[PDB]
Amino acid sequence: HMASVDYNTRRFLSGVSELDRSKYFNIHSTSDDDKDVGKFLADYQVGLGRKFWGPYSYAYNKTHEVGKYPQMKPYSGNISVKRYIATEHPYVQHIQGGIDVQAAGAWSAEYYSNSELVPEFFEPLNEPFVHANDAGFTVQGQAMRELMVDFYASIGKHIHNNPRLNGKMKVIGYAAAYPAWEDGNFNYWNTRMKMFIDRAGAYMDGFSVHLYDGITKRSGSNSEAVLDMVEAYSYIKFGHVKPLAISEFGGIDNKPDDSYDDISSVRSVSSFNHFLFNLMERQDNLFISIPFVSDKAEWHITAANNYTSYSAALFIPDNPQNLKNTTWRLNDKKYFFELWKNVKGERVDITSSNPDIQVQAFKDGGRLYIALDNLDDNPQTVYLNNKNSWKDVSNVTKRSLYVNYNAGIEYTEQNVPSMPESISIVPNQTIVLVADVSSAFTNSIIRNKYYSSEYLKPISAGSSLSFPFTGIESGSGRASLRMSIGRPVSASKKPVVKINGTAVSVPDNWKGYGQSNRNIFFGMIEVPFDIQLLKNGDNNVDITFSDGGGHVSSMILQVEKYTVS
């Protein structure tokens, strides 16, 4: 396996090259007013964030009745924007059968437009649909999912029609907990996220989902397919993608309760890394992402919980029964942020021959950062190639974060005397190489994605499926097809694939695991091919499976084209 870095070629994801740290290196908190958390944020260069508080928790606190809103103290001064996501629990205190949805929406706009400081993102209800059958709701099931979507729609409509908020606050939804698009032969997609996009999507600035590994893995090809489907349908519906927001990502350890444990609760860090590389490659269509690691989470530390900390906590009190006076310990989740500290700059060109080895590279003035992650279940040796034999690179330091499920995190920083010829990387290990670079850019390469008017197509044995694409700027560089399929695990993953009539090789491998422990495979399989097969303008992809069943969920062409600028 090989990875190649060209630090003399600047890389763009459509219009952006620079890494936006604020899209990634965040905690699931807004506790920057805590002395310990605030110091951590500065020390590790971390942003915010997410909070369960908003117009509906504020209003209920005043009126003690769902769907009834107080008067907001009038305020007509400047509105500043704090970068975080405000969300609400999908409680009966916030939404209920019989609610006046237009009044609820009006209230969000009244609450925020009379505030001196608003969140950059409002995500009205957290994981709403999984709560649609909760006993306390007087409307349940599909009717409640529809009411929750109408609540979202009203909020987006009212916020956007308020000139004090429009352009300042972005409304995102639906904070999806369980992005099992494929369930029920894609009935789940049709009745959850498709329905959301159809019924509230016009009023949303972007679409939000939660991405978790069980410790059943979404990292790798499943999460890629999950997010590609949202983009692919948004293109069809709106004529363009809308940005994504990954309002939680991490791991869930499968534990009889949600209490923190020093070994089990750090297993999530490997998931942070595995998802991060996916999301870095989406920066041009990503508002924000939030690693699911929080703060002191003092709300959890109660008699009823035996004074345990919450699993997602970042700080653990030395004395849980004296919270007023206790010292607080920063746990080993800190090493996720240590690994990525100072990493920034313009993307530079990088490729990896093995889809299980995720690669990133950035150049910030005289510093070069090269990152690798192993999604496979075996160690892999990766040959590192550079066309200039690294002549301009010196003072190499290797950072390594290895998550072992029994031993916890092993984090090391080592000076090495030259860029390595090859690197061995074990499962759940992420490496960041930091070096000085003295070089200037002689070329750029621009990654664009092209979406089809066709999506969600049922597969029949021997029956070709045609996917048209338009507006392609072809040229020199690289290209690939992102082919997402949901099929029984035994169904073929090796269709015949033709690019403008020319058959191309379909790889055996894809990002991450085989999903053998799932009944339905739902994943994006990349099919690299020669860019020279693409034409300027219209292109067609035709694919044929030898067996029936399942669907092609989305087909997206990725083109990385050499460009001046």
Ligand X SMILES: *[C@@]1(O[C@@H]2[C@@H](O)[C@@H](O)O[C@H](CO)[C@@H]2O)O[C@@H](COS(=O)(=O)O)[C@@H](O[C@@H]2O[C@H](CO)[C@H](O)[C@H](O[C@@H]3O[C@H]4CO[C@@H]([C@@H]3O)[C@@H]4O[C@@H]3O[C@H](CO)[C@H](O)[C@H](O[C@@H]4O[C@@H](COS(=O)(=O)O)[C@@H](O)[C@@H](O)[C@@H]4O)[C@H]3O)[C@H]2O)[C@@H](O)[C@@H]1O
- Does position 356 interact with Ca ion (CB under 5 A)? The reply is yes
Give, rounded to a whole angstrom, the gap between the first and last alpha carbons of the chain.
Answer: 31
- Does position 129 interact with Cl ion (CB under 5 A)? The reply is yes
Among 16, 117, 323, 416, binds K ion (CB under 5 A): 117
Find the part of the chain contacting ligand X (CB under 6 A) among 133-141, 289-297, 366-374, 553-561: 289-297
Q: Give, in order, the Cα–Cα distances in Å from 386 to each of 84, 351, 370, 391, 531.
A: 39, 11, 12, 9, 21
Q: Pairing mode, if any, of strands 429-437 and 422-425?
A: unpaired
**Whole-number Å distance between alpha carbons of 375 and 277:** 11
Question: Which 8-state DSSP code applies to residue 229?
Answer: H
The residues in 229-288 that bind ligand X, with binding defined as CB under 6 A, are 248, 252
**Known catalytic membership, residue 127:** yes
Based on CB atoms, which residue is closest to ligand X, 312 or 524? 312
From the list K ion, Cl ion, ligand X, none, pick the one residue 460 interacts with, judged by a Cβ distance below 5 to 8 Å according to partner type.
Answer: none
User: Tokens standing for 248?
Assistant: 């939680």
CB of 563 within 8 A of CB of 444? yes
511 annotated among ligand-binding-site residues = no
Closest CA to 447 of 537, 563, 286: 563
User: Tokens standing for 290?
Assistant: 């939030």
Q: What's the closest the beta carbon of residue 127 comes to K ion, in angstroms?
A: 7
160 annotated among ligand-binding-site residues = no
Based on CB atoms, which residue is closest to K ion, 216 or 453? 216
- Does position 51 interact with ligand X (CB under 6 A)? The reply is yes
Q: Which residue has the tokens 């099919």?
A: 527
Q: What's the closest the beta carbon of residue 221 comes to Ca ion, in angstroms?
A: 8
**Known catalytic membership, residue 248:** yes
Q: What's the closest the beta carbon of residue 177 comes to ligand X, in angstroms?
A: 5
Catalytic residue among 18, 127, 146, 454: 127
Q: What's the closest the beta carbon of residue 95 comes to ligand X, in angstroms?
A: 15
80 annotated among ligand-binding-site residues = no
Angle between helices 55-63 and 101-113 (to 10 degrees): 100
224 annotated among ligand-binding-site residues = no
Based on CB atoms, which residue is closest to K ion, 107 or 510? 107
Closest CA to 19 of 372, 349, 283: 283
- Does position 78 interact with ligand X (CB under 6 A)? The reply is no
300 annotated among ligand-binding-site residues = no
Q: What is the dihedral of CA 87, 89, 90, 94, to 10 degrees?
A: -90
Among 16, 117, 130, 489, binds Cl ion (CB under 5 A): 130
242 annotated among ligand-binding-site residues = no
Burial string for 67-91 (b: 16+ CB within 10 Å, else e) reads: bebeebeeeeeebeeeebbbbbbbb
Q: Give, in order, the Cα–Cα distances in Å from 476 to each of 282, 443, 444, 445, 563.
A: 22, 12, 11, 9, 9
Q: Which residue has the tokens 């907990």?
A: 177
62 annotated among ligand-binding-site residues = yes
Alpha-carbon Rg of the chain, whole angstroms?
24
Q: What's the closest the beta carbon of residue 410 comes to ligand X, in angstroms?
A: 24
**Whole-number Å distance between alpha carbons of 50 and 412:** 30
**Whole-number Å distance between alpha carbons of 52 and 1:** 45
Find the part of the chain contacting ligand X (CB under 6 A) among 133-141, 292-300, 419-427, 545-553: 292-300
131 annotated among ligand-binding-site residues = no
- Does position 349 interact with Ca ion (CB under 5 A)? The reply is no
89 annotated among ligand-binding-site residues = yes
- Does position 52 interact with ligand X (CB under 6 A)? The reply is yes
Q: What's the closest the beta carbon of residue 80 comes to K ion, in angstroms?
A: 9
**Whole-number Å distance between alpha carbons of 421 and 352:** 15
Catalytic residue among 123, 182, 231, 248: 248
Among 18, 34, 45, 58, binds ligand X (CB under 6 A): 58
From the list ligand X, Ca ion, Cl ion, none, pick the one residue 356 interacts with, judged by a Cβ distance below 5 to 8 Å according to partner type.
Answer: Ca ion
- Does position 28 interact with ligand X (CB under 6 A)? The reply is yes
- Does position 384 interact with K ion (CB under 5 A)? The reply is no
Applying CB under 5 A, the residues found at the interface with Cl ion are 129-130
Catalytic residues: 127, 248
Binding annotation for substrate: 28, 51, 53, 62, 89, 126, 210, 248, 294, 299
Applying CB under 6 A, the residues found at the interface with ligand X are 28, 51-53, 58, 61, 126-127, 177, 210, 248, 252, 292, 294, 297, 299, 310, 312
